[PDB]
């Protein structure tokens, strides 16, 4: 989007500490704003499902430093 | 050092020396960490070879030590300067420096009115100082229940070898008033070291 991951995300943190409705980056508009009224629209289930898999593999594989293999 | 070796003169030109500074910066503050607080370990530190010093005070440690980098140098002042302030906060000022100078440049490099960046670490001090001016929540000798008695009693609880802090809560009250000397800004506070104090076996 041509932005500053440094500067912008905090602005959206700020605009979620000031706003906090949808305020977020638009790669489309190349700006930052409420994405729902920036019309960037996706279901929450995929995001719910993103969460479900997010921590899942995360918490999953971190439970293995103890790994076994038997190519033999 | 790190990265480009092409020019001497401690010119590593950016992040290299900057990191070679944060290295040196994270290098010097280490002794202080293990020496931080009264639970900070006590460092026997060789002065020459058989010449040694056993010190848990980073500032005192620093004073024997020498500064091999500006990163090593700029802290050994401010640490000994905060030591020069009192000696309370010697170890305090030391450590946080090593973290912020990889933090400080990262923002102030980007310019866009380059002046005001590290004031983000300053206004925070203000923001802190204000709150720091606001804390009677803990540490009150301003008034206790017995005031300077219990204040000393809890202080004689802060340093406690025994049930001392019974008479010794009162002695410290007796002590500050035992000393009467001109003290300025109007202080009834009178120096606590000069108190005439005698030991009886």
């Amino acid at each position: 989007a041509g932005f500053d991951a440094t500067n912008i995300l905090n602005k959206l943190r700020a605009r979620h500490a000031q706003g906090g409705t949808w305020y977020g980056v638009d790669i489309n508009n190349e700006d930052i704003a409420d994405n729902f009224e920036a019309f960037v629209w996706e279901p929450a289930m995929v995001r719910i499902n993103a969460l479900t898999a997010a921590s899942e593999a995360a918490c999953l594989i971190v439970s293995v430093d103890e790994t076994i293999k038997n190519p033999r | 050092m790190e990265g480009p070796l092409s020019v001497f003169g401690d010119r590593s030109t950016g992040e290299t020396i900057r990191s070679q500074n944060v290295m040196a910066a994270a290098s010097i503050a280490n002794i202080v960490k293990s020496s931080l607080g009264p639970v900070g370990l006590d460092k026997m530190l060789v002065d020459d070879i058989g010449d040694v010093t056993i010190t848990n005070d980073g500032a005192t440690i620093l004073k024997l030590l020498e500064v091999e980098h500006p990163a090593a140098k700029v802290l050994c002042e401010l640490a000994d300067l905060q030591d020069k302030e009192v000696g309370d906060g010697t170890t305090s000022v030391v450590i946080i420096a090593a973290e912020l100078l990889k933090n400080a440049d990262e923002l102030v490099k980007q310019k866009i009115h380059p002046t005001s960046v590290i004031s983000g670490y300053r206004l925070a001090c203000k923001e802190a100082v204000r709150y720091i001016n606001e804390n009677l929540i803990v540490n009150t000798d301003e008034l206790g229940r017995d005031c300077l008695i219990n204040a000393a009693k809890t202080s004689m609880s802060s340093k406690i070898i025994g049930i001392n802090g019974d008479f010794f809560a009162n002695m410290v009250v007796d002590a500050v008033l035992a000393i009467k000397y001109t003290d300025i800004r109007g202080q009834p506070r009178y120096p606590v070291n000069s108190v005439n104090i005698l030991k009886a076996h």
Partner: protein, 200 residues
């Protein structure tokens, strides 16, 4: 020369000067020192090392009172004031956003090192030190108040937050307002050089 006469100018005036030998040590004890107020507290102990023992215990009951008599405003000693300030200043950074959410938070995250290192210096499980303090520290309690609805205190010889709110091992607002800026300084202190070069 001992041939010198004596005049009363070198005489001290007192209600009485009476000789009290106590402990098998005779002292000159001036009752009613007239031209100022005076006191001395003798320390009864098993030995003078036992007296060395409590005398030093007395000295950090002194300077703390003194430093309090120096500044009525104070803090608890240690990075526990950070533990409040840090997340608060990281919060105080948050709505700033941009550059400014970084600095004040990149500031306040660097605060945390002092007490936790001091904690593990006491082997206090620095996870504990943060667990206790910044729990109490909240939006519920953003509040130092004058009092404890949260505990912002850290005992230094303990390495662990205790319940001592009067203790003499803390520090006033004096050295702490200083240590902040000096810490902010070293962020700046190295940065003033303009350009760079090398010499022959």
């Amino acid at each position: 020369e001992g041939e010198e006469t004596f005049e009363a100018a070198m005489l001290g005036q007192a209600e009485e000067v009476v000789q009290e030998r106590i402990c098998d040590d005779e002292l000159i004890l001036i009752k009613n020192t007239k031209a100022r107020t005076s006191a001395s507290i003798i320390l009864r102990g098993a030995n003078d090392f036992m007296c060395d023992e409590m005398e030093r215990s007395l000295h950090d009951a002194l300077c703390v009172v003194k430093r309090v008599l120096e500044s009525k405003s104070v803090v608890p000693g240690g990075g526990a004031v950070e533990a409040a300030l840090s997340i608060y200043l990281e919060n105080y950074a948050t709505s700033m956003g941009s550059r400014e959410q970084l600095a004040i938070a990149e500031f306040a995250r660097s605060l945390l090192v002092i007490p936790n290192t001091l904690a593990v210096n006491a082997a206090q499980d620095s996870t504990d030190l943060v667990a206790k303090l910044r729990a109490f520290h909240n939006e519920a309690q953003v509040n130092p108040e004058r009092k404890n609805l949260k505990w912002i205190g850290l005992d230094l010889s303990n390495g662990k937050p205790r319940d001592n709110k009067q203790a003499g091992v803390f520090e006033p607002t004096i050295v702490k307002v200083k240590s902040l800026k000096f810490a902010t300084e070293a962020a700046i202190t190295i940065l003033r050089i303009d350009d760079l070069i090398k010499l022959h």
